[PDB]
Design a protein around this motif. Structure first.
Motif, PDB file in Angstrom:
ATOM      1  N   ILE A  20     -15.265 -51.865  23.587  1.00 30.21           N
ATOM      2  CA  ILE A  20     -16.186 -52.632  22.786  1.00 30.21           C
ATOM      3  C   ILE A  20     -17.038 -53.459  23.736  1.00 30.21           C
ATOM      4  O   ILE A  20     -16.508 -54.164  24.599  1.00 30.21           O
ATOM      5  CB  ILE A  20     -15.439 -53.579  21.817  1.00 30.21           C
ATOM      6  N   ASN A  58     -21.127 -57.346  18.875  1.00 32.88           N
ATOM      7  CA  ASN A  58     -20.347 -56.260  19.422  1.00 32.88           C
ATOM      8  C   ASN A  58     -20.967 -54.892  19.154  1.00 32.88           C
ATOM      9  O   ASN A  58     -21.628 -54.686  18.140  1.00 32.88           O
ATOM     10  CB  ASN A  58     -18.957 -56.211  18.789  1.00 32.88           C
ATOM     11  N   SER A  60     -19.252 -51.332  19.224  1.00 35.49           N
ATOM     12  CA  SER A  60     -17.983 -50.686  19.403  1.00 35.49           C
ATOM     13  C   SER A  60     -18.047 -49.191  19.571  1.00 35.49           C
ATOM     14  O   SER A  60     -18.813 -48.493  18.895  1.00 35.49           O
ATOM     15  CB  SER A  60     -17.081 -51.052  18.234  1.00 35.49           C
TER      16      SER A  60
END
Length: 195
Positions: A20, A58, A60
């Motif tokens: 991530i 984030n 991912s």
């Protein structure tokens, strides 16, 4: 001003495993632009989440594939200025490791030296790697060097560390010219100690 960019748990990812990438700034950015330079160039717009003093976003990766490997940089932005962005975060190379036989890592004169001794770490293998990458624990960017001509059986790169100052734990990897972000399995770690 530039945000920070880090990979969780780290930037060196095994094939098909997860990673991530997180952009963050103590500056309250509304959005972040995550840019990748690699086989598949792309720029992703991420919504900044505010976490008590920090703004972060984030990206991912469920299954690490070569299309997501490359050099990443993050930019922060605000909507009242749609056509301008922050300075870029330092680059972060997301690499796929563990694809080939691990090389060997050794130190000359040795791994335990007095401050000032000129140390060189050599990465070697019988596999015909074109490039070697040297990683130092806790240090951000891997160094790289082309492998030396096969000296009958062995392909090796010698990384000078210069006069010893501080010790560290090093690892190295081999790669091929066709694919700069696809590396071998890590060499066994080498602890260099400096007195």
């Amino acid at each position: 001003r530039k945000p920070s960019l880090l990979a969780h748990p780290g930037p060196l990812v095994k094939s098909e495993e997860t990673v991530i990438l997180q952009c963050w700034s103590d500056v309250m950015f509304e959005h972040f632009l995550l840019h990748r330079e690699g086989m598949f160039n792309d720029t992703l717009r991420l919504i900044g989440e505010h976490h008590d003093g920090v703004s972060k976003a984030n990206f991912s990766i469920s299954r690490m594939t070569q299309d997501l490997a490359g050099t990443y940089r993050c930019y922060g932005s605000v909507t009242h200025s749609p056509y301008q962005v922050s300075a870029p975060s330092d680059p972060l190379d997301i690499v796929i490791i563990g694809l080939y036989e691990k090389p060997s890592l050794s130190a000359q004169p040795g791994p335990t030296v007095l401050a000032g001794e000129n140390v060189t770490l050599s990465c070697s293998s019988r596999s015909s790697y074109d490039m070697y990458h040297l990683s130092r624990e806790g240090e951000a960017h891997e160094r790289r060097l082309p492998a030396g001509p096969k000296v009958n059986g062995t392909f090796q790169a010698d990384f000078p560390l210069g006069p010893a100052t501080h010790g560290g734990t090093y690892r190295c990897f081999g790669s091929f010219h066709d694919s700069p972000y696809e590396w071998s399995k890590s060499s066994d770690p080498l602890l260099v100690s400096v007195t």
